[PDB]
């Protein structure tokens, strides 16, 4: 005979790109319990009731469960409760359910009752830990004296997991702990997949996301028995090792600087009453030849008390009326339904339909009507442009007082979010977490959404999304997945970062329909809309101290998308600042180009 046996090692950890860890993995001393298949439930009260002279057992919380198994640990109670009922594993269950778990224990029973199902809970040959009051050093040095006394039981050492305070701590996740096994909802995916039922897994975020890879390798033995089941002999077929760690893309002095330009910013705009309605701001900055995630930082404002809070998984996970950004997307989308061609002259005017207010950009009457190309649609924020497209792709020309056809109107609205989820707009972006956002993205809607859609005033984006969105513009139309774990390494000698077993590789998600001469010109407008000389030139903000050329896009909301260098895009960034009524000045270019320099500076561009 051959009994096989699991035990767990320690698990990877967490570090930033320049290898400051981020968790811990933290030694403690601990009472452990290794059973044997010999052991009856007799022998574990003997065992439990010597050990409650040595710990305390304060709360004892039991299950009723708990309380049969205790109950019908005596022999004799165990055949009379079968005697009296109408394969020995159905009949221990039967009996189970027959007992009334309304029996009297005084509290001193209790607490050996406790005792006893922790060391009932662990396998044949295994080895758990018996959970007690903490030890302190002289309790402990007491238990190693006589534990030789108690069949099973030792002091060892185990491990608490501590997430350390830094600015991506949020981000991390959290594990489940060596009590609260394994999480229930899941616990028949883990059963399957391989694991103990002890076992600590990750349950959020980055934790849970590469729990595969973090996972100790477990030490695995065969214990060999005689021709009566006895332990004979203990032989090993695997020994175990410390997880595996990861490696982020961010870098912990880049994030925290981030940070404190948007709390900065954000103050001053509350300062000044610009912000006093909104919810917040955040950024996030990708490098769009990779993916590699630089920084994702948010900054809460609740609008019932007032209070900020940090608030990075804002990226991920909370939405947000976009705005003007958007209409690079809205001109792909004429360019693939055939409605536009090249860089096309349409005359900026009013848009005038029955049945709705007539339609204006920010500028409204001051230049009268006037021609406009495409580039020039991107550099003034154009509305009129963006409109007349959308109506092209529901197959109809503007004529002003027109009224409006919706025969083609789902169609319409499938056509323009399809461009729009080629650029993470409305779409699954990727990201290396368990559960991202993807927009507030309506199934219910009329034509005026439509049109409002397609200049940033209906479908809802997370922040992730709009970085993702520039990031593609920037890499010439090949969207990529961004991630936030850069490489996984091995352990060195001390346990700490070691080397290299494999970089996380860029993944390319589509490819934009759009021909290189038309990305052209969206990369022309973008320039423009941060170069340009017009009275109607938007975003010359974002090159006013500027350390590399920026092109970008700026966007009730002050929201901002740009990347850098120009020629050789190293950076790309979407802000998110919602709600901000200042009219005199937009900081969100400001704050965009000044995350830029930030980078720059950090990791030189040229
Ligand atoms: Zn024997
Ligand atoms: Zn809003
Ligand atoms: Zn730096």
């Known amino acids: 005979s051959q009994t096989k046996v699991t035990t767990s090692s320690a698990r990877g950890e967490i570090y930033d790109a320049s290898g400051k860890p981020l968790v811990e993995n933290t030694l403690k001393q601990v009472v452990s319990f290794t059973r044997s298949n010999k052991m009856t439930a007799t022998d574990l009260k003997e065992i439990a009731k010597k050990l409650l002279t040595y710990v305390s ?41 027959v007992p009334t778990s309304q029996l009297n224990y005084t509290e001193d029973e209790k607490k050996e ?16 830990t018996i959970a007690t009051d903490p030890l302190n050093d002289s309790q402990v040095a007491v238990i190693a004296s006589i534990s030789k006394e108690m069949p099973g039981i030792s002091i060892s050492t185990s491990w608490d997991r501590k997430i350390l305070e830094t600015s991506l701590s949020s981000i991390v996740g959290s594990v489940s702990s060596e009590k609260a096994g394994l999480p229930a909802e899941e616990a028949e995916s883990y059963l399957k997949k391989g694991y103990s039922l002890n076992d600590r897994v990750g349950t959020s975020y980055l934790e849970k996301q590469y729990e595969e890879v973090l996972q100790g390798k477990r030490p695995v033995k065969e214990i060999h028995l005689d021709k009566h089941g006895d332990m004979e002999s203990v032989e090993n077929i695997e020994e175990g090792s410390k997880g595996k760690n990861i490696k982020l893309t961010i870098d912990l002095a880049f994030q925290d600087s981030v940070d404190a330009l948007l709390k900065s910013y954000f103050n001053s705009e509350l300062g000044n009453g610009g912000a006093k309605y909104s919810e917040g701001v955040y950024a996030v900055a990708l490098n769009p030849q990779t993916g590699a995630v630089l920084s994702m930082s948010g900054l809460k404002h609740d609008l019932k008390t007032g209070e900020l809070t940090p608030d990075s998984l804002g990226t991920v996970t909370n939405v947000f009326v976009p705005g003007s950004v958007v209409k690079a997307a809205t001109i792909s989308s004429g360019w693939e339904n055939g409605v536009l061609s090249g860089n096309q002259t349409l005359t900026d005017q009013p848009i005038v339909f029955q049945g709705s207010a007539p339609i204006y950009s920010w500028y409204k009457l001051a230049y009268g009507s006037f021609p406009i190309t495409a580039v020039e649609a991107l550099e003034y924020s154009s509305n ?43 779409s699954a972006t990727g990201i290396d977490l368990p559960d991202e956002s993807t927009g507030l993205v309506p199934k219910e809607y009329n034509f ?3 049109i409002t859609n397609a200049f940033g005033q209906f479908d809802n984006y997370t922040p992730m999304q709009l970085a993702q969105y520039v990031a593609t513009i920037a890499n010439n139309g090949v969207r990529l997945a961004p991630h936030i774990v850069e490489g996984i390494y091995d352990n060195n000698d001390k346990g700490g970062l070691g080397e290299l077993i494999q970089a996380i590789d860029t993944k ?24 340009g000389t017009s009275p109607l030139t938007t975003g010359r903000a974002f090159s006013d101290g500027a350390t590399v050329s920026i092109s970008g896009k700026t966007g009730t909301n002050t929201n901002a998308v740009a990347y850098a260098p120009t020629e050789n895009p190293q950076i790309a960034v979407a802000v ?26 950090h990791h030189p561009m040229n």
């Open 384 to 426: 009129a442009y963006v409109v007349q497209t959308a109506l092209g792709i529901m197959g109809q020309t503007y004529q002003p007082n027109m009224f409006v056809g919706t025969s083609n109107l789902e169609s319409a609205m499938g056509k323009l979010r399809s461009t729009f989820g080629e650029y993470g707009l409305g």
């Open 576 to 601: 998110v600042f919602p709600h901000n009524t200042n009219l005199t000045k937009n900081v969100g270019p400001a704050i965009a180009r000044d995350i830029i320099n930030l980078y720059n500076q």
């Open 508 to 531: 390319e998600i589509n490819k934009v329909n759009i021909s290189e001469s038309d990305m052209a010109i969206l990369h022309q407008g973008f320039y423009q809309v941060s170069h």
């Open 57 to 97: 057992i304060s709360s004892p919380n039991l299950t009723e469960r708990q309380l049969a198994d205790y109950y019908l640990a005596d022999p004799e109670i165990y055949k009379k409760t079968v005697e009296a009922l109408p394969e020995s594993e159905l009949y221990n269950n039967a009996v189970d359910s």
């Open 113 to 128: 009752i406790y005792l006893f199902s922790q060391l009932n809970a662990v396998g044949n040959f295994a080895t758990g």
């Open 448 to 450: 005026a959404n439509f």
